[PDB]
Curated annotation (Swiss-Prot):
Family from the record: Belongs to the TRAFAC class translation factor GTPase superfamily. Classic translation factor GTPase family. IF-2 subfamily.
Effect of T39A: Impairs the GTPase activity, but not the ribosome joining function
Stated name of the protein: Eukaryotic translation initiation factor 5B
Segment of the intact protein contained: 401 to 1002 of 1002
CC cofactor note: Binds 1 monovalent cation per monomer in the active site, which can be sodium or potassium. This structural cofactor stabilizes the GTP-bound 'on' state, and may also act as a transition state stabilizer of the hydrolysis reaction.
Protein purpose: Plays a role in translation initiation. Translational GTPase that catalyzes the joining of the 40S and 60S subunits to form the 80S initiation complex with the initiator methionine-tRNA in the P-site base paired to the start codon. GTP binding and hydrolysis induces conformational changes in the enzyme that renders it active for productive interactions with the ribosome. The release of the enzyme after formation of the initiation complex is a prerequisite to form elongation-competent ribosomes. Stimulates 20S pre-rRNA cleavage to mature 18S rRNA by PIN-domain endonuclease NOB1.
Organism of derivation: Saccharomyces cerevisiae (strain ATCC 204508 / S288c)
Annotated positions of the Phosphoserine modification: S5
One BP annotation, GO: regulation of translational initiation
Gene name, Swiss-Prot/TrEMBL: FUN12
Length: 588
């Protein structure tokens, strides 16, 4: 079959040696020879299949060699056919590695582990650019022992993340279990193994996805101003052809963009000057490669967008909506019932990450946007100055705030969070959010109410103190929880809350307990109530066995649960139950 080059994406923190590794992978030098024609493309490194043959020849000692693809495309960092996750063998799994994993697990992206820094093993004797198994067999038992120890431990850490993993040459299910390749960015050892392994995971196992199509599949990786071309887009082309003159369609920061390709540019191999970039122009390019596109009207292009070519039979305005679906999807996250915070980002990826980060922090999003922040955008935020000032906030990632807009912001006191790095923004905002919750909380007697719904099985003591036997229908019942009924006053047709009091104590089979959840018991729970402020409703007269009871929850009580010390212990079911109780209590 006719296949294009597999696209590989490499992830890791700088500290793992990730960038050193990539640079080692690129170099021309190998054992007795040179790897020829490795080219820097736009936002990617291209390895022609012959360069790959040269870099993996040493692998002929351990494996059958086949070459069914034209080459291999690597992106530094699902458009990726395969991801390479670099882990430091001397550190093991760290927090960021855990995050990259969940990310890959969520997106169903296949990946391999590069177990980097084996040169740091004590007494390691390097053979430059060798295969792993060859150098390894030449090492002392001490070196071998240290490797086994640190490797076996990382294997267990990966198992903790729900990943079954194995050294690649011992992997009995390469399509399921994660293959581990030991490497060294310093010596080049294991690089032949990694490249070999990437072919073995793509050529046949993913050939269907590598089948060269005529239909254009392209993705904008970066939006960049270039001397002489104005604003260009760096794209990865994964299927089809791009040609000068092609009418392209992409997502912009103010709706779809239609234009025509003016130039198709790749780096000039040998530049006369170090600060004057220039490019080879091409009439056409074939998947798969990284290529820069020049064209009018790209000034508002957004990184992360798909790029489509309007064909003969294709409708233009139809394809314009198609490319807006990715953002449209992200719009589904915004608050429909009123408003929350304003979010602005540089790319579709960074926006999705911010939304997701705000989602699990349970912070509502009023509005979303891409690119530079203007007066208009901060003016959207000013509509929260009256309602909830806690959300008179903008969360910006990697975007310029206009001078006018910045000046308006402190004129009206709107908080602007902005960062070039995702984590600093994430942390600095979580920092500010953690200040606000400490300030506000000291206003009511009980901080954080957990949600529950209760069915009264029997009244145990009518009053002084009211003690009720119940069945926990939903959620979790706790000591300190204020319990109530909700009943409609016939005279006014108004729904009223009838507070019975706060749980002093809980007993199951006459043995005390600190909390009871749905399913814990089937014997009933005796609930001892402390009187409330003002008159306790009278059993029979005001409240009886046919009334469903609820944790009394409030806007305030809900915000409190969004503190770090509660957020982790609130099951998903309890958040869902809280949403229902809002309707019971009339909380917007």
């Amino acid at each position: 079959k006719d296949l294009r080059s597999p696209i590989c994406c490499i992830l890791g923190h700088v500290d793992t040696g990730k960038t050193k590794l990539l640079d080692k992978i690129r170099q021309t030098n190998v054992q007795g020879g040179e790897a020829g024609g490795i080219t820097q493309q736009i936002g990617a490194t291209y390895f022609p299949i012959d360069a790959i043959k040269a870099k993996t020849k040493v692998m002929a000692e351990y494996e059958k060699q086949t070459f069914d693809v034209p080459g291999l495309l690597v992106i530094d960092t699902s458009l990726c056919n395969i991801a390479i996750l670099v882990i430091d063998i001397m550190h093991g799994l760290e927090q960021q590695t855990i995050e990259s994993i969940k990310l890959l697990r969520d997106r169903k992206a296949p990946f391999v582990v590069a177990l980097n820094k084996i040169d740091r093993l004590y007494d390691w004797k390097a053979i430059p650019n060798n295969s792993f198994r060859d150098s390894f067999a030449k090492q002392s038992r001490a070196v071998q022992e240290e490797f086994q120890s640190r490797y076996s431990k990382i294997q267990l850490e990966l198992a903790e993340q729900g990943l079954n993993s194995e050294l690649y040459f011992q992997n009995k299910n390469m399509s399921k279990y994660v293959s581990i390749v030991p490497t060294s960015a310093v010596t080049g050892e294991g690089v032949p193994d990694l490249l070999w392994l990437l072919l073995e995971l793509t050529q046949k196992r993913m050939s269907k996805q590598l089948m060269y199509l005529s239909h254009v599949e392209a993705t904008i990786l970066e939006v960049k101003v270039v001397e002489g071309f104005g604003t260009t887009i760096d794209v990865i082309l994964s299927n089809g052809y791009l040609r000068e003159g092609d009418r392209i369609v992409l997502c912009g920061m103010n709706g779809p963009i239609v234009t025509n390709i003016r130039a198709l540019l790749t780096p000039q191999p040998l530049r006369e000057l170090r600060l004057k970039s220039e490019y080879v122009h091409h009439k056409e390019v074939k998947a798969a490669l990284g290529v820069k596109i020049a064209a009018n009207d790209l000034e508002k292009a957004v990184s992360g967008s798909r790029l489509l070519v309007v064909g003969p039979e294709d409708d233009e305005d139809e394809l314009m909506d198609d490319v807006m679906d990715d953002l449209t999807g992200l719009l589904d996250s915004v608050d429909t019932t009123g408003k929350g915070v304003v979010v602005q980002a540089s790319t579709l990826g960074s926006l999705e990450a911010l939304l997701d980060f705000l989602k699990d922090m349970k912070i509502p999003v009023m509005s979303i946007g891409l690119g530079p922040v203007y007066k208009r955008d901060v003016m959207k935020a000013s509509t929260m100055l009256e309602k909830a000032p806690e959300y008179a906030v903008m969360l910006c990632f990697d975007v310029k705030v206009d001078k006018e807009a910045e000046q308006y912001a402190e004129q009206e006191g709107i908080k602007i969070f902005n960062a070039d790095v995702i984590y600093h923004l994430f942390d600095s905002f979580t920092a500010y959010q953690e200040k606000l919750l400490e300030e506000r909380r000291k206003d009511f007697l009980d901080y954080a109410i957990f949600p529950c719904v209760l069915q009264t099985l029997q009244i145990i003591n009518k009053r002084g103190p009211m003690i009720i036997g119940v069945d926990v229908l939903e959620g979790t019942l706790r000591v300190g929880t204020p319990i109530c009924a909700v009943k409609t006053d016939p005279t006014t047709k108004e729904r009223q809350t009838l507070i019975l009091g706060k749980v002093i104590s809980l007993e199951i089979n006459h043995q005390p307990v600190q909390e009871v959840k749905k399913g814990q018991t089937a014997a009933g729970v005796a609930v001892r109530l402390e009187d409330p402020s003002g008159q306790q409703p009278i059993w029979g007269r005001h409240v009886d066995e046919n009334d469903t009871l609820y944790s009394l929850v409030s806007r305030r009580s809900i915000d409190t649960l969004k503190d770090k010390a509660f957020r982790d212990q609130v099951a998903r079911s309890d958040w869902l139950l809280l949403k229902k109780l809002k309707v019971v209590f009339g909380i917007e």
